[PDB]
Ligand binder design. Structure first.
Ligand SMILES: [Cl-]
Ligand SMILES: [Cl-]
Ligand SMILES: [Cl-]
Ligand SMILES: [Mg+2]
Ligand SMILES: [Mg+2]
Ligand SMILES: [Mg+2]
Ligand SMILES: [Mg+2]
Ligand SMILES: [Mg+2]
Ligand SMILES: [Mg+2]
Ligand SMILES: [Mg+2]
Ligand SMILES: [Mg+2]
Ligand SMILES: [Mg+2]
Ligand SMILES: [Mg+2]
Ligand SMILES: [Mg+2]
Ligand SMILES: [Mg+2]
Ligand SMILES: [Mg+2]
Ligand SMILES: [Mg+2]
Ligand SMILES: [Mg+2]
Ligand SMILES: [Mg+2]
Ligand SMILES: [Mg+2]
Ligand SMILES: [Mg+2]
Ligand SMILES: [Mg+2]
Ligand SMILES: [Mg+2]
Ligand SMILES: [Mg+2]
Ligand SMILES: [Mg+2]
Ligand SMILES: [Mg+2]
Lengths: 136, 386, 61
RNA sequence: GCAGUCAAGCGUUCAUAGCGACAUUGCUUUUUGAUUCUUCGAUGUCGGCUCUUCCUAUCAUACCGAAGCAGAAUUCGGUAAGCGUUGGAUUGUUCACCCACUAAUAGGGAACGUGAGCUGGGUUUAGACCGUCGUGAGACAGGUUAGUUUUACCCUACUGAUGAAUGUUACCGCAAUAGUAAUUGAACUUAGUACGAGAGGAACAGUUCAUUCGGAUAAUUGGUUUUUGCGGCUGUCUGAUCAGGCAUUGCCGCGAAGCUACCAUCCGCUGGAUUAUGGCUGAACGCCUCUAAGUCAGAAUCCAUGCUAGAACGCGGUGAUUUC
RNA sequence: AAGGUAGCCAAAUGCCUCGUCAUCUAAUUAGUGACGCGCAUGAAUGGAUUAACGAGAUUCCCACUGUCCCUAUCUA
RNA sequence: GUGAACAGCCUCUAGUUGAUAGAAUAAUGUAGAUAAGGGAAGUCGGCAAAAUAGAUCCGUAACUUCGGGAUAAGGAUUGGC
């Protein structure tokens, strides 16, 4: 998550290793996000860094506005297709993988989010919650 | 030359050798330190693992996100019928270690205990303890002398107890006998307590209570001969590998010109002695109590046994202990429950647990009904009942 | 404790059982087991599956 | 390659906080040479992959000393190898060079560890092309493309598994010795506080989680299907129907049990003695001094507690011990 | 004896060399397009260009996947 | 018989029923297979495997020696009665 996070997050099953491409759910002009790193990841030989709901990643825009391409920017995952278990015993998952472009502090580059947003991500990042319409 | 990249070692070297346990009943190698300013009590108990189920409770932990919120947890149920005290043993301190000095047995022993002393019970004359019982035929002078010797010399007192295997759905018929150390009181008080409990039963609720941390000692599930990949968790070799890929590629350098003890090798997996600590008790159940699986919220009348019974075990008809999490060993295996060796105050202990719901759906499939009455209410009347 | 209802079959869902599916339009679906979820993913219609609650209501069984 | 000695000078003043010319004394065998002792009736040859252990000249983590150390950050040094030291683009590469995460991305050894462990991209047989050289056959530590990687059943080592003989047999125990394990980060709070003109900006205790690792476990979720359990479908065969055979498990959907996944859940203890260092009392030396006698506190260190095995030539307690 | 013309190139031919610029990527000793005092390109020792074809040698993209993250299970 | 078919698959005539056997179902193999989320991050290199596939209808670029490229690419449909 890096700096700017409010509180901590219970562990969520990882489903987005490095190299995954997820949809862009904001209106910044990007159409997909290509994850190159995960903030706060550990070290293990041969193990790919992987991200889950609410994590902050480093991504590059592959499709979208020309000014957003060919550069590295932080992003926050807001939807996850890999199923995970909540502490109330519920296993759940989304239809797609989605993220939003942000800054190192967590402030959103855009101003609107399309589609549902996971509850864990909204609580961790106050800026995402403000721009989200429906949580879960 | 040095290895190209650094990685931590595979496996724990303190759990060596990975051989089969000497007996199916795992040994208790450490008892709690005795405090002799307390009443005499047992320090462990014997039970049989029946199975696992699920509970719902409200979390009481300030600062947690799920504070004052329901959580779903897995628990393990241990069938714990009362044990029978049938003897006592005294130990003397020695420069070479603790040594057993005297053993005194009860006057009468049931067929459950006597089967433990035989390998061919059906053919034997059943002569065990026949001459020893004659020591009670007189006024007990022989028994009094041995008990006096324990009081005079012993520094550690343990009691011999056996399970009531006939009360379980198991087909063994042969009870398990074990020593349990007595903590609290003087040596004379320990011996008097043991003597008065000959041929008596001790219930589990006199040993353990609600919201108490206990340790589980048992022999793990066996799996036979196992390769290195699953036995130690080594990386699988590439698909191109000739001569097989579920192996360790290099088992040692040229020098020393020997295979070292710290290299992963294929061999026995499972059936090892294990001691796992800090397992909180969620419920101490009573066998004669109807509505064993009922809470103050559910209010329905149902036992702890799931619909169709515990898979491969049967029904629970005696006292039981419900413990949070998982326990070493498989179903139908004798387990030993031990009190904590230290006082835990991590705020995960000492917290009061209040169960709100206990799952009693069938574990033989995707069970969807808690009770037979609920099933009747949903499906209605079937062709068989009309 | 709260008991939910299977979206495909109408079966009761106790805590911990089944999965929860959030569709793209932010519609929430509950399934008691993997069979109903698999039939939902195959786009089967519950009114033509004989053992479902909706089928029994439609045919007045 | 690494480390000392001396101190002209650098450092606003100020040799030695941190550096240090001219000279000089060493250490190391992770460079390359020098040599030709061993091997040409053959010790398989580059790199990577995999796995274990060792060294400390310590990158990070623990505890400290010093500063041109206000705070924050950094720099020099000590005890310390207990514990970690990564994911990728290009290259056959060792090396190198960038991107990124991270507490950190420290340097090395083990026949330049490791080919009856793999792989065969490179080098280094025979085919072929190019450039330069040669009259030519051909040469090139120049470039390019294609080119068979054999054997363990023996001994030992290692991992597990039995077992004669200690009157017989059975049950309950003791513990010599050997092994041993946990690890690191973030957020909240302390606190916009101490400190500082300001800009900036901590720490101890407390709480909630997470990283790496380890040991188990299968209630739940996911995976697996010869349950060939139920249903469906194609071709053909048994006259039709019913019910079946064959298609090397015919195919598809669901699918209990078992096994199993940081793709699931649970658990991973606390006492003593010390190192560096900071002190007490106190001489030598009428004073002064942590040291000489004595003595206090003290590190991820050590030994125990705890955990695993149980000497098959270590040991104790207890039951029953045969008449054709 | 004449001194490399037309073309072409760090090309299977360039030592220096991972040449310089541009493009491709988050990052390229790779690829491509240019540049040429070219160690040592060059005209039937054939130069340059070419549709179609190739179990030939290379680079990138889409689809695809147990190659991999990270292993698990079943049959003979 | 199915089908475009001397393809694969099943059957009639005819011919064989031969290849050391019994028991058990550890590791490692050989052969055949399936996988949540990600999708070449693996590797010298997509090696291996997967995906595509018949027929009818629609639609088809640069370039070209005008013959091709071409099944380019990209879509739709398919049973029974
Ligand atoms: Cl270890
Ligand atoms: Cl020549
Ligand atoms: Cl196998
Ligand atoms: Mg044992
Ligand atoms: Mg091979
Ligand atoms: Mg079950
Ligand atoms: Mg020889
Ligand atoms: Mg050799
Ligand atoms: Mg040889
Ligand atoms: Mg070597
Ligand atoms: Mg070889
Ligand atoms: Mg070798
Ligand atoms: Mg060899
Ligand atoms: Mg080669
Ligand atoms: Mg050759
Ligand atoms: Mg495991
Ligand atoms: Mg022994
Ligand atoms: Mg040139
Ligand atoms: Mg070029
Ligand atoms: Mg000419
Ligand atoms: Mg036809
Ligand atoms: Mg898959
Ligand atoms: Mg999938
Ligand atoms: Mg790659
Ligand atoms: Mg790689
Ligand atoms: Mg291929």
């Amino acid at each position: 998550s890096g700096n700017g996070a409010q509180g901590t997050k219970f562990r969520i099953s990882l489903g987005l290793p490095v190299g995954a491409i997820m949809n862009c759910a904001d209106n910044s002009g990007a159409r997909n996000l290509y994850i190159i790193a995960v903030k706060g990841s550990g070290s293990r030989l041969n193990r790919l860094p992987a991200a889950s709901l609410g994590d902050m990643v480093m991504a590059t825009v592959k499709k979208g506005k020309p000014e957003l391409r060919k550069k590295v920017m932080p992003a926050i995952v807001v939807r996850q297709a890999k199923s995970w278990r909540r502490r109330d015993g519920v296993f759940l998952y989304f239809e797609d993988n989605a993220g939003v472009i942000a800054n190192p502090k967590g402030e959103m580059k855009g101003s609107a989010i399309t589609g549902p947003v996971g509850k864990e991500c909204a609580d961790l990042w106050p800026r995402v919650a403000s721009n989200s319409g429906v949580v879960v | 030359s040095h290895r190209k990249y650094e990685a931590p070692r595979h496996g724990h070297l303190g759990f060596l050798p990975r051989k089969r346990a000497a007996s199916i009943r795992a040994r208790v190698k450490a008892f709690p330190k005795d405090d002799r300013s307390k009443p005499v009590a047992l320090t462990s108990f014997l039970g049989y693992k029946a199975g696992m189920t699920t509970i719902v409770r409200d979390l009481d932990r300030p600062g947690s996100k799920f504070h004052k919120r329901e959580v779903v947890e897995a628990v393990t149920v241990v069938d714990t019928p009362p044990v029978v005290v049938v003897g006592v043993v005294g130990y003397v301190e020695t420069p070479r270690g603790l040594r057993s000095l005297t053993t005194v047995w009860a006057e009468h022993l049931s067929d459950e205990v006597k089967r433990r002393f035989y390998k061919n019970w059906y053919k034997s004359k059943k002569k065990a303890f026949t001459k020893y019982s004659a020591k009670y035929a007189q006024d007990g002078a022989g028994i009094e002398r041995e008990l006096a010797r324990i009081k005079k010399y012993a520094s550690v007192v343990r009691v011999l107890v056996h399970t009531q295997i006939r009360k379980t759905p198991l087909a063994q018929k042969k009870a398990h006998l074990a020593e349990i150390q007595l903590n609290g009181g003087s040596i004379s008080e320990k011996v008097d307590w043991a003597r008065e409990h000959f041929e008596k039963t001790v219930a589990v609720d006199s040993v353990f209570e609600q919201n108490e941390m206990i340790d589980a000692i048992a022999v793990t599930k066996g799996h036979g001969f196992e390769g290195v990949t699953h036995r130690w968790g080594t990386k699988k070799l590439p698909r191109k590998t000739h001569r097989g890929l579920r192996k360790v590629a290099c088992i040692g350098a040229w020098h020393p010109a020997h295979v070292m003890w710290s290299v992963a090798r294929a061999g026995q997996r499972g059936y090892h002695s294990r001691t796992s600590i800090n397992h909180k008790i969620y419920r101490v159940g009573k066998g004669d109590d109807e509505a064993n699986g009922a809470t103050s919220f559910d209010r329905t009348k149902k036992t702890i046994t799931p619909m169709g019974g515990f898979v491969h075990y049967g029904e629970i008809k005696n006292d039981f202990i419900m413990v949070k999490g998982c326990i070493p060993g498989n179903r139908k295996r004798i387990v030993t429950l031990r009190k904590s060796l230290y006082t835990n105050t991590s705020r995960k202990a000492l917290e009061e647990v209040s169960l709100k719901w206990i799952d009693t759906a069938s574990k033989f499939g995707k069970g969807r009904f808690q009770t037979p009455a609920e099933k009747h209410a949903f499906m209605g009347t079937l062709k068989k009942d009309l | 404790m709260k008991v939910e209802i299977d979206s495909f079959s109408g079966a009761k869902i106790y805590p911990g059982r089944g999965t929860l599916f959030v569709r793209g339009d932010s519609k929430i679906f509950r399934f008691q087991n993997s069979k109903s979820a698999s039939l939902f993913k195959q786009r089967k219609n519950p009114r033509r599956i004989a053992w479902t609650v909706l089928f029994r209501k439609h045919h007045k069984k």
